[PDB]
Design a binder for this molecule. Structure first.
Ligand SMILES: *[C@@H]1O[C@H](CO)[C@@H](O[C@@H]2O[C@H](CO)[C@@H](O)[C@H](O)[C@H]2NC(C)=O)[C@H](O)[C@H]1NC(C)=O
Ligand SMILES: *[C@@H]1O[C@H](CO)[C@@H](O)[C@H](O)[C@H]1NC(C)=O
Ligand SMILES: [Fe+3]
Ligand SMILES: [Fe+3]
Lengths: 48, 679, 31
């Protein structure tokens, strides 16, 4: 439950924010792994 | 809310670049749930120390002398991870300090005033503390402040991090004295470059940087290093011609906020990937942007500092004493006529009581400082609050390994020549009931036990050595069903069966009811199957020799001792079957106080010793109420030891071999610290 | 009701470094 709530809160924390249009490769990799890790935690979490 | 992260503290932009590559590589290796590096740029190292103490930063690398600056309040730092300089075949924790000069300059070390000197920094170890310490007492008064006096000693110099505004001579060769890599003269190779430019006449660096900067052999054949006995040698006999050894550089972090484990995991993966050229695509110890960034160049790996060792135990005693006399600015004369009073050490309200009474009955030569456990008091002797202590041979092994010497031994036999005769050493036995005659040495498994204290001779070393040959396992709460051995860990059954309450069970002081000799015997009588004591225990607790009730009712013809082959021998004959011999208890102290402890204690044993009858009402030094406090209760006199003052010559070959057989099972953290200090 | 429990699927384990959480249900890892 706590892991699901932390995931949804961090995704809304990303859903706030300042929006960039252009990104370098290394930081966009970290963004993709971050949000993919988040919803992956979610879709595991609701089943558990 | 929010997860773990590691942050590092940076000095300049080169540290930010190297820290940036370090971030991307260490986020490349670790899984996404593991924490990564961050980079926080600060201007100087001292501002970085206050950045750690005010929790903006977590870790940063310092020298030894700078560790002494970071130790102080309100900073409250702690050394957590050191680094070794040798190959992985043999790690070396200390490194040398040398002074490189130009060929054919032709000047001695002693008359070195009025020359150009280049220092690697203010307060650093091989740059500042050793040269000013060796040159220190030759300067005239006023010596405080130090930078003014050294500024008048040389005719101008370079020393970064020194204050240019209050002292202009320290920046006379370096126009800005800046605590960063932006200064080209800052650092080891900056000081060697200060010699290589010819602007500096003498430089002070480690033994390896002249091998770092110069690749040609003739360039090495030019530059020379001066010796301490005013001679000259070339470079590669730095093991022959050095000034002093210093401890290595150390990653420091704060004490309460932590955290040691996370830094040590991260730097474990760092040392396993990047140290000894496993990867070409990134190096951790060398970098093209600059040298000595974030770490040293001559480092080859990281060693964990044990949790016991804080900064004063890390630097040693001579180094802290020298650096404190150098900060405070005092050249000791010490003519050595009279003796300052000895600060004896006690523990927990019975030793402290007795020690205070002896401090008043003596005219003032003895004063008392208390600790709680005996390991903590031995550490309190090492860093320097306490002078002398009497403790058994199993702790003369530990304290002797930590760097202390025994002076006077205890005698147990009454004679006219007891003060000079080296006695032989007492016997250790195991006492069993008469009510159980089925007990043999061949079968001790699953049956109860009683020990005096963890780490002692007759309670620990002599039993668990001879047992350790047979069991061949390092744990012991599996071989015994349960027992009593105070000083073990609280999860065990060994601390579970013991007596004291509340929260004082298994605590190794006199507040444990089953502690020590008489307490182990009371463990045997009340709840015990076998006990492990000295041979002298049963006639001293037999037959109303104690006014205590439980010892008043007992007799010795019941309580019998068992042998090694299994055959029960009666109590009066101990020599036919002793478990093993144990050396006498001895008084240990630091090496510099050996003469005053010797001269004072020989005076004190005459006035209050064993010839003083009418013991009740007046003072007796050795007689106690069978708590066996400050000294064993049956001591007659204390023997003067000439020619045998080390731990190994005092304890002897068979016993040192026995503890050496036990050595991989000892869990005392102070032994781990005093072993880690060794190279 | 029933004196016994049908699903035994609540028992679980993760690695000792806490790097990965396993489960009894499909597909037993979040990654
Ligand atoms: C204890 O001290 C005595 C002397 O105080 C040692 O020497 C002899 O002991 C025997 C008893 O076994 C006496 O009869 C002798 O008179 C003693 N003196 C001599 C021979 O000069 C003794 O060895 C010491 N140790 C023990 C274990 O008793
Ligand atoms: C015994 O004690 C007395 C009382 O001070 C002292 O004069 C004498 O030297 C002592 N005897 C010794 C130390 O042999
Ligand atoms: Fe250094
Ligand atoms: Fe002893």
């Amino acid at each position: 439950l706590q892991k699901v709530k932390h995931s949804i809160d961090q995704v809304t924390a990303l859903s706030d924010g300042v929006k960039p249009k252009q990104v370098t490769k290394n930081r966009l990799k970290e963004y993709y792994f971050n949000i993919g890790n988040y919803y992956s935690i979610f879709k595991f979490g609701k089943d558990s | 809310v929010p997860d773990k992260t590691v942050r590092w503290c940076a000095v300049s932009e080169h540290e930010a670049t190297k820290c940036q590559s370090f971030r991307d590589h260490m986020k490349s290796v670790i899984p996404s749930d593991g924490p990564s590096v961050a980079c926080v740029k600060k201007a100087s190292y001292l501002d970085c120390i206050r950045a750690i103490a005010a929790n903006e930063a977590d870790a940063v690398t310092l020298d030894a002398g700078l560790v002494y600056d970071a130790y102080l309040a309100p900073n409250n730092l702690k050394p957590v991870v050191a680094e070794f300089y040798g190959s992985k075949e043999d790690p070396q924790t200390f490194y040398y300090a040398v002074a490189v000069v130009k060929k054919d300059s032709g000047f001695q070390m002693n008359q070195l005033r009025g020359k150009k000197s280049c220092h690697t920094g203010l307060g650093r170890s091989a740059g500042w503390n050793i040269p000013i310490g060796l040159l220190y007492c030759d300067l005239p008064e006023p010596r405080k402040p130090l930078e003014k006096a050294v500024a008048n000693f040389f005719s101008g110099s370079c020393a970064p991090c020194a204050d240019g505004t209050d002292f202009p001579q320290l920046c006379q060769l370096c126009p800005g004295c800046g605590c960063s890599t932006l200064n080209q003269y800052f650092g080891y190779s900056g000081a060697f470059k200060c010699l290589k430019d010819g602007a500096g006449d003498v430089a002070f660096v480690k033994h390896s940087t002249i091998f770092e900067n110069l690749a040609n052999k003739a360039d090495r054949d030019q530059y020379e290093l001066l010796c301490l006995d005013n001679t000259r040698k070339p470079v590669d006999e730095y093991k022959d011609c050095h000034l002093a050894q210093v401890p290595s550089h150390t990653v420091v972090a704060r004490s309460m906020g932590g955290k040691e484990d996370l830094i040590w995991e991260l730097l474990n993966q760092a040392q396993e990937h990047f140290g000894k050229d496993k990867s070409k695509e990134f190096q951790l110890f060398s970098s093209p942007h600059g040298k000595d960034l974030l770490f040293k160049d001559s480092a080859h790996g990281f060693l964990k500092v044990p949790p016991r060792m804080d900064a004063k135990m890390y630097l040693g005693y001579e180094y802290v004493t020298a650096i404190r006399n150098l900060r405070e600015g005092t050249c000791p004369e010490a003519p050595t006529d009279e003796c300052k009073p000895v600060k004896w050490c006690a523990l927990s309200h019975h030793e402290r009581l007795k020690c205070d009474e002896w401090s008043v009955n003596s005219v003032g030569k003895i004063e008392c400082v208390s600790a709680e456990t005996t390991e903590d008091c031995i550490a309190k002797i090492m860093n320097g609050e306490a002078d002398a202590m009497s403790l058994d041979g199993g702790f003369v092994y530990i304290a002797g390994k930590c760097g202390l010497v025994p002076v006077l031994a205890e005698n147990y036999n009454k004679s006219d020549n007891c003060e000079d005769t080296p006695e032989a050493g007492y016997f250790a036995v195991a006492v069993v009931k008469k009510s159980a005659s089925d007990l043999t040495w061949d079968n001790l498994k699953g049956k109860k036990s009683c020990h005096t204290a963890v780490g002692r001779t007759a309670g620990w070393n002599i039993p668990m050595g001879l047992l350790y040959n047979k069991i061949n396992h390092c744990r012991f709460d599996e071989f015994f069903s349960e027992g009593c051995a105070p000083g073990s860990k609280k999860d065990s059954s060994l601390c579970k069966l013991c007596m004291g309450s509340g929260l004082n069970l298994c605590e190794p002081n006199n507040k444990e009811g089953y502690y020590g000799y008489t307490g182990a015997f009371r463990c045997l009588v009340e709840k015990g199957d076998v006990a492990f004591v000295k041979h002298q225990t049963v006639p001293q607790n037999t037959g109303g020799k104690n006014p205590d009730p439980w010892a008043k009712n007992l007799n010795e013809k019941d309580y019998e001792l068992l042998c090694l082959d299994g055959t029960r021998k009666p109590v009066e004959e101990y020599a036919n079957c002793h478990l093993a011999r144990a050396p006498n208890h001895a008084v240990v102290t630091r090496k510099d106080k050996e003469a005053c402890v010797h001269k004072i204690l020989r005076q004190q044993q005459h006035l209050f010793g064993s010839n003083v009858t009418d013991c009740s009402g007046n003072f007796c030094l050795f007689r106690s109420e069978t708590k066996d406090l400050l000294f064993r209760d049956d001591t007659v006199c204390l023997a003067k030891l000439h020619d045998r003052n080390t731990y190994e010559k005092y304890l002897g070959e068979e016993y040192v071999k026995a503890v050496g057989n036990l050595r991989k099972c000892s869990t005392s953290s102070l032994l781990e610290a005093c072993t880690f200090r060794r190279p | 009701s029933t004196n016994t429990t049908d699903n035994i699927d609540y028992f679980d384990i993760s690695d000792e470094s806490n790097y990965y959480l396993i489960s009894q249900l499909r597909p037993h890892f979040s990654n």
